[PDB]
Amino acid sequence: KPLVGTGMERAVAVDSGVTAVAKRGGVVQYVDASRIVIKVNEDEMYPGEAGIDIYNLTKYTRSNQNTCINQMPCVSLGEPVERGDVLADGPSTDLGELAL
Amino acid sequence: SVTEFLKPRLVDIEQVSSTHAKVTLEPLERGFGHTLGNALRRILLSSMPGCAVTEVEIDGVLHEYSTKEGVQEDILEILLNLKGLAVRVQGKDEVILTLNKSGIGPVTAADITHDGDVEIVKPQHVICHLTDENASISMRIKVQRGRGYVPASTRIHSEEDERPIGRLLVDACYSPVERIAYNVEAARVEQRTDLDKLVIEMETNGTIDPEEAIRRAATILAEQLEAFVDLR
Amino acid sequence: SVTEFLKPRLVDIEQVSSTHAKVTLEPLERGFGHTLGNALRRILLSSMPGCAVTEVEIDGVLHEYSTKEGVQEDILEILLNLKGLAVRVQGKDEVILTLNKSGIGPVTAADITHDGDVEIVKPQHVICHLTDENASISMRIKVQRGRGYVPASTRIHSEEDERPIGRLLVDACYSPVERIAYNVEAARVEQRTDLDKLVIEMETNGTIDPEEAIRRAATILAEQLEAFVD
Amino acid sequence: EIKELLKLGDLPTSGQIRLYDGRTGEQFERPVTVGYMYMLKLNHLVDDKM
Amino acid sequence: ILSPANGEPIIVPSQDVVLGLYYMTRDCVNAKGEGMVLTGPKEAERLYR
Known about the structure:
part of a larger assembly, 5 chains, A: mainly beta, four-stranded antiparallel β-sheet, three-stranded antiparallel β-sheet, 1 helix, E: mainly alpha, elongated, DNA-directed RNA polymerase subunit beta (chain A), DNA-directed RNA polymerase subunit beta' (chain E), DNA-directed RNA polymerase subunit alpha (chain C), transcription (chain C), DNA binding (chain C)
C-alpha cells in the first residue's frame, strides 16, 4: 500500500472490476484461494433461496498486456462482512486499496 | 612504545534478544577501530556461511503458479514464506525435512519433524493456513548451507540433471546477518586517555553465534591479508 | 564449499621510480578489494611509524613571520624545506642535529652534521639559498620517531614544554607515505566478472621502499587482529 | 503538519539525517535527504527491448 | 571533440562533474585546517583523506 496517498485508492479499487466485492452481507462460511463461500444474513435471504454466495476467484490469467491477473482472498474464516466489503484483492490491490 | 601496538580483544557479549546482539572489542589505538569497523561491516554483511532452503516438494502441487484445496494463500506465497525461514544445521550441508499437518488453523514451523542436528530458530513462524477440515498438507523441504545470495536461474542454468515434475525452486539467501552497526567510542583502560573501544550491534536471524561471527570475519580478513603480507 | 573463497594470484608490480609503486592484485572477491584498499590506505596514512622533524630553533630568528637578511627565502620556506626532509634515525627515538653554513649559500641536506645513528636519504635535497657571501646560518633541528601525521596546530596547546622562545613548530609527518590511492575494476575468471581487481598507487619519501611500506602495513594490520583469529 | 508528525516520532524535524559511505565508512560532509518513497516499475523491460 | 556547426567544443561536463568541481574549488572562512602551510598537493590530499 502507498505510505503517502490521496484517499482515492479505495474508490478506484472498488469501482474497478478486478476486486471481488460482497453482493450481500453475511458471515464467511468457507475461505480458500480458489473459491469463497459466504452465508448471507437472514434478513437478506430471498424467499425460496439457499442463501449461499459463491465467488470464484480468477487465478493467473493473462491480461491484454501479457501480464498476470491474480486474486488473493483478504478475509478470514468466520469474519463478518457487509455489502460493499472487499473479499479478495485483485492485481495491484492491497486490502481494497490500489497499489501500483 | 610507538612501534608496538596494543592488542584488541573481545571483552563482553551482550545479547539483547535471540537475534539482536552486541559485541565489544577493546582496546584500540586512535582510528584503528574505524579501520577495523567498516572492514568488519564489509565482511559480516557480504560473505557469511548460512543455511537456506533451496527446493520444495508438495504432493498436491504441480507448479509454483497453482493453488491447493484447503489452503488460504497461493503456493507462491508458501514459497515466499519458506524463503524467510531461519534454520541451523551442523554436521552436514544437506537436510530433507518433512512437514505434515491437518485440521483448521495455521501451520507453524514447529510442525516440522526436525532431527537432532536441525534446530528451528523461529518455531512460531507461520507458513500457511488450513481452512478445510478434510485438508492435509505434506511437504518436503530441502535445506543447504552456502554463502551470499544466488537465484534459481543459476541453478537451472547449471542443469546437473532433469528435475522431477512438482519440484519447486526457491531463491536462496544464505546470509544470516541483516544489520550491522559499528560505533567507536572512548575507552578507559590504564591511564593512556587515548584508547578507544568498538561496539558492534548485530541484527541477525539468530542462526549464527555473534562471537563466532566476529571470529569468522577476522579469520577471513587475516587470510585475505596474508596475500598482501607475502607479496613478492 | 563455503571457505575456499578466492585470492589474487595475478599479482603485478610496476616501479616507475625508486619511490613509485603501481601494484595490481586480481582476482578478488566481490567487494573485498574496497575493504582491503581502504584498510591499507588508512593504516599507511595514520598508523605507519616513522622518524621525522618536529621543531626547529633558528639562531637570530624568534617568530615564524620574522625575516632573515642572509637567506633570500623566508622562514616559512625554510620550515617547508625542513618538513620535506626525510630522515631514517634508528639508534634513538629523538635526536638533535646541528647545521652550520657560511659563504655561498646553496645549502642542501648534505651540510648537516652527520652522526652515526642518523641517516639522510636525500643529502642533495635543497634547504635554503643564502645569497650574501658574508652570511652564516646556524640551525638546530629535532627529529623524533612518531606515527601518522601530527599537525603543529595540535602541538600548539600545552605550551609549557615550548616555553623557551625560538622553538618554531613544524608539521610532524612521521609516516613515510604520500599519495596513496586505490582503484577497483572488474576482472573475469571462469565467466563471472563480479570479481574485483585492486590497483594501488603509492609514493614514498625515500626512507623505505614502497613495497616494504606495503608489507609493513599489511603485517601490522594482520597482527592487530591476531587475538580474534585464534 | 509534516514537521509535527516527524517530531512525534524520533526523527529530526528538518528531514535530513547524516549518512555514512558504505565503501569508506566516513561521515558525509553535508546531511542528505532520506525517506521512504513510492516507486513504480513501468512496463518497459530491458529484455523485451534487447 | 569540436562541433562542426560553430567550432565550440562538445566534450564538456554537464551535471555531476560540474557540481563536484564546484564543491572542490570553494573556500570557507573558519574551515578546519585553515592557515596551515603545505609543502605540496600530495600533503593536501593526504591531510584531506
